[PDB]
């Protein structure tokens with residue numbers, strides 16, 4: 356609805372409704388009703404101002420750093436918590452770098468949260484790509500980022516660089532198959 | 548000019564200390580004062596918001612000190628373990 360639409364959210368239904376006037380296909384819904392909802396959610400949203408993201412404008416640079424529109428406000432709160440409020444433009448920049456570092460992957464939950472965590476981590480410590488190319492520095496990487504190189508989240512299409520992956524997990528290494536077909540069922544009875 | 552009368556750091560260059568890398572809270576301490584430690588060994592479990600860094604062993608030796616208990620708050624570049 357209009358007042359919960361736009362920017363990192365999805366397009367306004369109210370706006371789309373009128374946009375199709377004249378064009379072959381119309382949107383099947385209630386105009387006046389969505390208007391009525393919009394006014395309601397316009398006021399209710401006012402309760403949640405403290406959680407509003409730092410975007411007030413469309414940004415075309417999202418075509419560069421491919422940050423999910425759902426992760427955005429969630430990750431802002433994360434940076435805000437980790438002493439990285441104000442320094443969130445640098446978190447977006449690294450996010451782009453963390454992607455091409457991983458062989459151009461799909462960034463959604465939780466793979467976005469891995470890139471998300473790798474980005475927040477490397478900014479925190481002023482690390483970069485060549486900080487681990489001939490280096491391969493032991494660093495105590497976050498849960499998600501080592502988890503990903505173990506394959507706990509699956510396999511990316513292009514995989515990981517053999518030598519890249521190695522220096523991020525030295526010891527108990529990678530698993531190949533989809534986690535399910537070795538991970539043994541939970542005993543729900545002992546949980547009860 | 549008159550003066551009006553009203554946590555340890557770490558090192559990231561030479562010696563093998565263990566500085567905090569994400570600022571947050573300590574969840575679990577596994578390593579004592581005097582104890583043997585081998586390679587890759589987990590030592591200290593610290594937690595952020597949606598983040599969990601379990602601190603491993605970069606070398607292979609004996610613990611000199613522990614600088615955090617249970618539930619202690621850490622900043623980035625803070626001493627935790629010093630190791631030879």
Ligand SMILES: *C(=O)CCCC[C@@H]1SC[C@@H]2NC(=O)N[C@@H]21
Pocket residue numbers: 423425426429430463464465466467468469471597
């Ligand atoms: C904290 O407990 C709320 C979850 C915040 C993380 C969410 S999960 C889906 C989005 N994708 C992502 O990488 N982070 C966002």
